[PDB]
Amino acid sequence: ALRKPLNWDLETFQFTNQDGKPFGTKDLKGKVWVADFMFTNCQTVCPPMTANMAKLQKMAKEEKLDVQFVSFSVDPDLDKPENLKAFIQKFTEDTSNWNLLTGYSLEDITKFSKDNFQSLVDKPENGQVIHGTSFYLIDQNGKVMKKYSGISNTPYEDIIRDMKRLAE
């Protein structure tokens, strides 16, 4: 069984993916998914985070786990769909189950990150947006259940275990 779940409520949302198509709760409700926050002009942790998410994607597929991946841009003023599409192509050849989202205001995503993921977003003068570095596991009921590091010793086996529990 899933131990010590977070049980965080998530608001209903509809954003735009890297193909310029609507995507959000409508698509995700009923699926197990993993979320992170990132931006394409990040000079530090976002590329390794994304590589880590790609490793998780590959491992989940190998285990025959049917899950979705979602990356929210925290720099929507710069990250349009074409930016996200070009960004993700470096890290994976599979986006059938990975949507990178944008299309909203910076204020919007700041509130969304605060209210749903208890994570501060703020864009300083140098443009290097402050945001959380966690991966979040969300269940079929649309609640956040687990948080893991996306950048430091990502616990791939723990995440896989938890996905297996949600699939049972």
Side-chain angles (χ1 to χ4, degrees), residues 58-77:
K58 193 181 219 67
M59 291 176 73
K61 189 71 169 195
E62 181 64 36
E63 295 273 12
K64 300 186 186 176
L65 288 161
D66 189 349
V67 300
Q68 297 291 317
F69 295 90
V70 176
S71 300
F72 300 98
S73 174
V74 299
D75 194 20
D77 295 317

Side-chain angles (χ1 to χ4, degrees), residues 19-85:
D19 294 324
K21 311 291 176 68
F23 195 85
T25 310
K26 175 183 183 290
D27 310 272
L28 293 163
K29 184 67 172 300
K31 291 175 177 290
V32 173
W33 56 290
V34 182
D36 72 347
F37 291 83
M38 49 142 281
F39 67 112
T40 74
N41 284 284
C42 177
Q43 296 176 336
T44 64
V45 300
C46 292
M49 285 177 64
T50 303
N52 295 340
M53 185 165 278
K55 181 165 171 58
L56 181 57
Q57 178 189 44
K58 193 181 219 67
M59 291 176 73
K61 189 71 169 195
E62 181 64 36
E63 295 273 12
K64 300 186 186 176
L65 288 161
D66 189 349
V67 300
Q68 297 291 317
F69 295 90
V70 176
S71 300
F72 300 98
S73 174
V74 299
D75 194 20
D77 295 317
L78 284 187
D79 292 352
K80 316 303 179 179
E82 65 189 358
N83 304 88
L84 294 172
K85 189 170 186 66

Side-chain angles (χ1 to χ4, degrees), residues 4-161:
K4 313 299 182 173
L6 296 169
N7 302 131
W8 294 349
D9 293 329
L10 289 186
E11 77 186 64
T12 299
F13 66 95
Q14 178 185 322
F15 299 152
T16 301
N17 72 9
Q18 69 266 28
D19 294 324
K21 311 291 176 68
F23 195 85
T25 310
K26 175 183 183 290
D27 310 272
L28 293 163
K29 184 67 172 300
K31 291 175 177 290
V32 173
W33 56 290
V34 182
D36 72 347
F37 291 83
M38 49 142 281
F39 67 112
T40 74
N41 284 284
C42 177
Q43 296 176 336
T44 64
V45 300
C46 292
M49 285 177 64
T50 303
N52 295 340
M53 185 165 278
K55 181 165 171 58
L56 181 57
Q57 178 189 44
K58 193 181 219 67
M59 291 176 73
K61 189 71 169 195
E62 181 64 36
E63 295 273 12
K64 300 186 186 176
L65 288 161
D66 189 349
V67 300
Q68 297 291 317
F69 295 90
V70 176
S71 300
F72 300 98
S73 174
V74 299
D75 194 20
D77 295 317
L78 284 187
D79 292 352
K80 316 303 179 179
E82 65 189 358
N83 304 88
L84 294 172
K85 189 170 186 66
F87 178 85
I88 193 59
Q89 292 180 342
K90 174 168 181 145
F91 301 96
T92 183
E93 297 189 302
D94 185 6
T95 56
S96 66
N97 67 335
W98 195 342
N99 287 273
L100 297 86
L101 305 182
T102 191
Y104 38 71
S105 70
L106 178 60
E107 181 169 358
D108 290 336
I109 197 62
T110 296
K111 184 191 176 301
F112 179 86
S113 182
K114 167 179 74 81
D115 284 353
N116 298 283
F117 294 90
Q118 310 193 6
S119 186
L120 175 70
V121 172
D122 182 81
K123 182 169 182 178
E125 289 185 357
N126 80 342
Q128 290 295 293
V129 188
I130 295 168
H131 61 93
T133 55
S134 298
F135 292 170
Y136 303 91
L137 180 65
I138 297 108
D139 73 4
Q140 301 98 315
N141 305 291
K143 305 298 179 191
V144 192
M145 299 303 261
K146 295 290 207 162
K147 182 185 90 175
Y148 318 92
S149 180
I151 188 71
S152 182
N153 191 23
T154 299
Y156 298 103
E157 295 80 11
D158 280 7
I159 303 173
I160 290 294
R161 171 203 63 202

